[PDB]
Amino acid sequence: AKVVKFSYMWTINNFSFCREEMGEVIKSSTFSSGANDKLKWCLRVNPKGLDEESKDYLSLYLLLVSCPKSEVRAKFKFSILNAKGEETKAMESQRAYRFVQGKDWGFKKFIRRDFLLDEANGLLPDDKLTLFCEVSVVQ
Amino acid sequence: EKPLQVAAVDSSVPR
């Protein structure tokens, strides 16, 4: 199995200005590996959760935005950058998931929002949420 | 009360 590792850091500025609706989606800019294979990825966040059951959480997904092949398998890992600059609260997929164009995989309940908004945890310094994604794609 | 994070992986489909 041939594997390409790559990563993306996303800073969401003005986090408290997100819309107060569970529908709302925010997406990152697209990013890619160096393998030069026409794959484009982005991150997707539901700041107020995906749906009623998850409304207390922030949801976080990896989306394969563009891919001219039938499928690609990839492992992934998300983390939050704290006010010290270190990664915290990471979660990984453990195994590789099958992506096709337009498909996303991730965590409906990535982190409870009240924890996020709790000043003492230092995860929204300056009203900014910084997320780090590591991806390992099978080539 | 509720877990801080749930490591269950799924695909963005609202319920």
Numbering used by the authors:
A (entry chain A): 27 to 165
B (entry chain B): 126 to 140
The authors write:
The adaptor protein, speckle-type BTB/POZ protein (SPOP), recruits substrates to the cullin-3-subclass of E3 ligase for selective protein ubiquitylation. SPOP recruits substrates via its N-terminal MATH domain, whereas a central BTB domain mediates dimerization and interactions with Cul3. Here, we show that MyD88 interacts with SPOP through a long degron that contains the established SPOP-binding consensus and an N-terminal site that we name the Q-motif. We determine the structural basis of these interactions and show that the Q-motif interacts with an unexplored binding pocket on the SPOP MATH domain.
To understand the structural basis of the MyD88-SPOP interaction, we solved a 1.9 Å crystal structure of SPOPMATH in complex with a MyD88 peptide, 125AEKPLQVAAVDSSVPRT141. In total, 15 residues of the 17-mer peptide were well resolved, with only Ala125 and Thr141 missing, most likely due to flexibility of these terminal regions. The MyD88 peptide binds in a groove on the surface of SPOPMATH, making extensive contacts and burying ~827 Å2 of surface area. The SBC residues interact at an edge β-strand in a manner observed in other SPOP substrates, whereas the interactions of residues located N- and C-terminal to the SBC are unique to MyD88. The side chain of MyD88 Val134 is buried in a hydrophobic pocket that is contributed by SPOP residues Phe102, Tyr123, Trp131, and Phe133, whereas the side chains of MyD88 residues 135DSS137 are involved in hydrogen bonding with the side chains of SPOP residues Tyr87, Lys129, and Asp130. MyD88 Val138 cannot make these contacts, and instead, the backbone NH group of MyD88 Arg140 forms a hydrogen bond with the side chain of SPOP Asp77, thereby directing the C-terminus of the MyD88 peptide in a different direction from that observed in other SPOP substrates. The N-terminal residues of the MyD88 peptide (127KPLQV131) form both hydrophobic- and hydrogen-bond interactions within the substrate-binding groove. The side chains of MyD88 Leu129 and Gln130 sit in a hydrophobic pocket that is contributed by SPOP residues Phe136, Ile137, and Phe141, with the side chain of Gln130 also forming hydrogen bonds with the backbone carbonyl groups of SPOP Lys115 and Phe136. This binding mode is stabilized by backbone–backbone interactions between MyD88 Leu129 and SPOP Arg138 and between MyD88 Val131 and SPOP Lys135. The side chain of SPOP Tyr83 is involved in anchoring the peptide in this region, where it forms a hydrogen bond with the backbone carbonyl group of MyD88 Pro128 and contributes hydrophobic interactions with MyD88 Pro128 and Val131.
